[PDB]
Amino acid sequence: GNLYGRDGAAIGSLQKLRFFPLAVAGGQGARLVEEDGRELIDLSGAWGAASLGYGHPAIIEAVSRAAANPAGASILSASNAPAVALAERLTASFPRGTHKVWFGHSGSDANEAAYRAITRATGRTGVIAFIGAYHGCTVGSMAFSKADGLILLPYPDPYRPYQDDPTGDAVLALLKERLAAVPAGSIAAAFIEPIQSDGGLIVPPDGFLRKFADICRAHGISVVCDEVKVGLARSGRLHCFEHEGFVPDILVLGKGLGGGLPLSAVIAPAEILDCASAFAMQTLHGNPVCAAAGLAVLETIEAENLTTAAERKGKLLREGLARLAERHELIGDIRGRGLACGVELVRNRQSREPARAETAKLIYRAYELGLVLYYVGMNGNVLEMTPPLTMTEDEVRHAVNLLDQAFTELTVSDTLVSQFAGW
Amino acid sequence: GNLYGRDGAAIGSLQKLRFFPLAVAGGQGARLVEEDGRELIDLSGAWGAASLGYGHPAIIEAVSRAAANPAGASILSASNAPAVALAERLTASFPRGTHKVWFGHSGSDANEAAYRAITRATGRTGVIAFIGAYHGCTVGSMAFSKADGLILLPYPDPYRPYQDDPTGDAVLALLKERLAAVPAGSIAAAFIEPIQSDGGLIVPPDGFLRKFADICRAHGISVVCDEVKVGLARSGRLHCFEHEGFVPDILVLGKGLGGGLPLSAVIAPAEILDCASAFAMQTLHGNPVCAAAGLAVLETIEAENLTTAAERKGKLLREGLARLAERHELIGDIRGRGLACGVELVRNRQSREPARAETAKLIYRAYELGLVLYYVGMNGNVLEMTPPLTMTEDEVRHAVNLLDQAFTELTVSDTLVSQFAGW
Numbered sequence: 001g002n003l004y005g006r007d008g009a010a011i012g013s014l015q016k017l018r019f020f021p022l023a024v025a026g027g028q029g030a031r032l033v034e035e036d037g038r039e040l041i042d043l044s045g046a047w048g049a050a051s052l053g054y055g056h057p058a059i060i061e062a063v064s065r066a067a068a069n070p071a072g073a074s075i076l077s078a079s080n081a082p083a084v085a086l087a088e089r090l091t092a093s094f095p096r097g098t099h100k101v102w103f104g105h106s107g108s109d110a111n112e113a114a115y116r117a118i119t120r121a122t123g124r125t126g127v128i129a130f131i132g133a134y135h136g137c138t139v140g141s142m143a144f145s146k147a148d149g150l151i152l153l154p155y156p157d158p159y160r161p162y163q164d165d166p167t168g169d170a171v172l173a174l175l176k177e178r179l180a181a182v183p184a185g186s187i188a189a190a191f192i193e194p195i196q197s198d199g200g201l202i203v204p205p206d207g208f209l210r211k212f213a214d215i216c217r218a219h220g221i222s223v224v225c226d227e228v229k230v231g232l233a234r235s236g237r238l239h240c241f242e243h244e245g246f247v248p249d250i251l252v253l254g255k256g257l258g259g260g261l262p263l264s265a266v267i268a269p270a271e272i273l274d275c276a277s278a279f280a281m282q283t284l285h286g287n288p289v290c291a292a293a294g295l296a297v298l299e300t301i302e303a304e305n306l307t308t309a310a311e312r313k314g315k316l317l318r319e320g321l322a323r324l325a326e327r328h329e330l331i332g333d334i335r336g337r338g339l340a341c342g343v344e345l346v347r348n349r350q351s352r353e354p355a356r357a358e359t360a361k362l363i364y365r366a367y368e369l370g371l372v373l374y375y376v377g378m379n380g381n382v383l384e385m386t387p388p389l390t391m392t393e394d395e396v397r398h399a400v401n402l403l404d405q406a407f408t409e410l411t412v413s414d415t416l417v418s419q420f421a422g423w
Numbered sequence: 424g425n426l427y428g429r430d431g432a433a434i435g436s437l438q439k440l441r442f443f444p445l446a447v448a449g450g451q452g453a454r455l456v457e458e459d460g461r462e463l464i465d466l467s468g469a470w471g472a473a474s475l476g477y478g479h480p481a482i483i484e485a486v487s488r489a490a491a492n493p494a495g496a497s498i499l500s501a502s503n504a505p506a507v508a509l510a511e512r513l514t515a516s517f518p519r520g521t522h523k524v525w526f527g528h529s530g531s532d533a534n535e536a537a538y539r540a541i542t543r544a545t546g547r548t549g550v551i552a553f554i555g556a557y558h559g560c561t562v563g564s565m566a567f568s569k570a571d572g573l574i575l576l577p578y579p580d581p582y583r584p585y586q587d588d589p590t591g592d593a594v595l596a597l598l599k600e601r602l603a604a605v606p607a608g609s610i611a612a613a614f615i616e617p618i619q620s621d622g623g624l625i626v627p628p629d630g631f632l633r634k635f636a637d638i639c640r641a642h643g644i645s646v647v648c649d650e651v652k653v654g655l656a657r658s659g660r661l662h663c664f665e666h667e668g669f670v671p672d673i674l675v676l677g678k679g680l681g682g683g684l685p686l687s688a689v690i691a692p693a694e695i696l697d698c699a700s701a702f703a704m705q706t707l708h709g710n711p712v713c714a715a716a717g718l719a720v721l722e723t724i725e726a727e728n729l730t731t732a733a734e735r736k737g738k739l740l741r742e743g744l745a746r747l748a749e750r751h752e753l754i755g756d757i758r759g760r761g762l763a764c765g766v767e768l769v770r771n772r773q774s775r776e777p778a779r780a781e782t783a784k785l786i787y788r789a790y791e792l793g794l795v796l797y798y799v800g801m802n803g804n805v806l807e808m809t810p811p812l813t814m815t816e817d818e819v820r821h822a823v824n825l826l827d828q829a830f831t832e833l834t835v836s837d838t839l840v841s842q843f844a845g846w
């Protein structure tokens with residue numbers, strides 16, 4: 001039987017998030033190859049995980065090398081050279097002598113470890129996060145995505161401003177209200193995405209995040225910046241907070257850090273990560289195969305000038321999309337930084353009413369045409385584009401061209417679409 | 424500076440479990456190589472993760488192949504061929520048409536997903552587990568290692584029988600007591616290790632586990648067998664429950680499944696893993712590089728006859744150790760199955776008083792001599808031996824020979840040992 005039907009027979013639905021019957025057998029560059037040999041351009045970049053695309057030589061080199069002479073299998077009960085070299089590279093990239101690293105398998109395990117560490121270091125359980133935030137899918141990362149003392153704030157959206165205040169100041173006022181109503185010093189941490197991912201690739205208003213961080217610092221609250229989606233060159237700066245005029249206390253990394261292998265990291269003050277031992281650990285954490293891949297990703301970002309590539313190619317992509325908006329009225333807003341781009345689809349440009357149903361057919365048709373992308377947003381109406389940082393300019397143009405065909409040929413049965421749960 | 428000091432400077436203590444300053448730069452076969460070039464025989468097999476040791480050709484082949492042509496990076500929003508092939512191989516190995524697979528990064532994420540799935544499928548939160556059990560190190564796997572409705576039982580130890588009943592029947596009676604005091608049907612699952620790992624490599628009494636599973640089945644309670652430590656050929660059968668006259672409802676796998684890469688799996692009734700979608704998911708789950716490694720491990724177990732190897736080489740190891748016991752009185756008990764072996768150290772053979780302090784020096788000295796092993800047990804007095812399944816017979820003998828030197832040359836300052844937290 002076909003690969004997709006074998007996938008239904010053999011793998012439980014528990015971890016599936018399917019939008020169309022993508023059945024992959026290989027990959028090269030920014031393209032996926034299906035079982036039948038059909039190629040698709042991957043604008044999703046595996047939700048951002050395939051930072052160097054598929055079969056990049058630096059990944060091949062590193063993982064093949066480490067597999068043939070691995071420095072053990074772990075950082076728990078052994079130091080290993082690749083893990084320590086990666087830890088030093090990551091701390092050197094982050095504004096010296098103050099921070100250390102913890103390694104994980106995923107953004108979920110990293111946000112969980114950051115939260116457990118700061119609650120253990122401070123003796124406080126309270127936590128600030130945002131409605132619609134995505135910090136992972138484990139009990140400990142879902143606690144704030146519940147924790148006692150959880151404060152959930154609206155994420156300020158330029159396209160849908162809270163209290164009709166485009167600046168986000170009303171959100172800051174709400175925070176101060178929420179903090180005033182609980183004891184001084186009861187809040188351990190604030191988790192923030194510097195571009196809200198599942199919330200709909202929302203770039204906050206100018207100045208908001210720095211003012212938010214200033215409030216947190218006035219209350220002694222650690223500012224944790226989750227850059228699992230938009231970190232490591234994707235935004236057109238190495239770290240996305242570089243666009244925003246603040247430095248967080250803690251940085252969470254994942255997804256594209258591993259280049260297609262499972263790798264996450266927390267960069268945090270030494271006192272936070274040294275407050276306990278044998279406390280947040282999984283046996284394969286810091287294994288040298290995945291550490292080697294991480295080192296390859298950082299080295300490639302430098303060697304291939306991918307921070308600048310992401311900036312340049314993002315501008316190309318957003319320009320392509322604004323040409324599409326001249327003819328496809330469904331496009332309401334085009335936004336993002338670098339190669340993290342969102343395209344919000346609306347039934348009408350004036351009311352901004354979300355276009356959920358059309359977005360799910362759009363991506364299905366795109367898939368039928370040879371282009372992979374997914375949707376996000378509380379209303380299921382934002383196209384997410386996070387392609388491999390190594391996607392060529394011509395591929396960017398082929399993808400916009402296929403998207404133009406999908407907006408035009410918008411054909412997919414309401415029955416065919418209903419076969420996929422998605423979200 | 425030296426690698427171990429760089430590890431202290433760069434990596435937080437949060438995930439460290441260190442017993443001596445092992446600082447690894449490479450690996451080959453069953454040997455680790457330190458930064459200075461010193462070789463050590465790895466009796467720990469990276470806590471059981473290095474099922475094929477270090478740089479095994481099947482791992483090299485598979486991971487190099489997949490890195491150069493990866494079928495995407497995930498099972499969430501795409502099917503992929505390696506993941507589905509691995510899922511089918513795993514279900515084919517487990518007693519047809521009833522079970523599916525969920526893929527994870529770790530034993531912690533797998534035991535967490537198994538627990539969340541069965542609680543979602545049943546609408547019940549209660550859970551049976553054992554004192555001293557190790558099911559992982561995340562909030563969701565620590566919940567039963569707390570969950571409402573948690574019942575914790577003593578694990579029956581032939582060397583220290585509960586209520587002086589060597590059979591374990593008193594533990595079964597205790598269970599029934601605990602179940603009688605809560606509503607019929609309030610318990611979702613029972614988590615069991617078929618050889619208790621951190622509890623001290625405890626093989627339960629004959630017949631206990633089957634009688635335990637029979638009780639659970641009489642109450643409609645799903646029996647989850649955590650074989651992250653002693654699964655996949657290590658015990659001298661493919662699945663350790665094969666020694667025990669029962670079949671669990673759910674099987675949890677990890678550690679050596681990945682051959683040094685992060686890979687876990689839950690094999691569970693279809694109704695359990697299909698009760699929700701987009702429910703327990705992490706982006707790199709089912710990535711094809713780690714799936715390829717898993718397939719290599721299963722293929723190698725078949726090609727290299729490693730189930731029989733583990734049985735044969737375990738008998739050799741335990742025989743070697745009984746020769747050591749004729750001269751080293753500290754050895755109280757030698758136990759286990761296949762290549763999961765525990766050696767319990769006692770101050771006196773008659774009282775069985777644990778020998779904690781000597782065990783920690785012993786392993787330090789072993790390390791100084793070129794042999795890596797760790798200790799476990801509630802009293803820190805059981806040597807754990809879980810070497811690579813590909814460890815040669817001669818290496819088994821070199822390791823017993825180095826251990827003999829360590830028991831003899833037992834030299835390590837009480838100050839030097841105190842520099843390592845361990846547990």
Ligand SMILES: *Cc1c(COP(=O)(O)O)cnc(C)c1O
Pocket residue numbers: 105106107108109111134135136137193197226227228229230254255704705706707
């Ligand atoms: C992907 C993502 C996570 C979770 O990472 P997983 O690898 O799926 O566990 C956390 N935060 C953000 C912002 C993400 O995009």
Ligand SMILES: *Cc1c(COP(=O)(O)O)cnc(C)c1O
Pocket residue numbers: 281282283284528529530531532534557558559560616620649650651652653677678
């Ligand atoms: C190692 C182990 C776990 C946890 O696996 P991690 O990879 O450390 O998360 C779970 N159960 C048992 C029996 C184990 O030995």
Ligand SMILES: N[C@H]1CCCCNC1=O
Pocket residue numbers: 076281282283440470557620621799
């Ligand atoms: N004994 C368990 C817990 C210690 C950390 C690593 N995993 C194990 O082998």
Ligand SMILES: N[C@H]1CCCCNC1=O
Pocket residue numbers: 017047134197198376499704705706
């Ligand atoms: N948008 C998040 C959550 C969906 C599952 C995968 N991870 C992501 O990219």
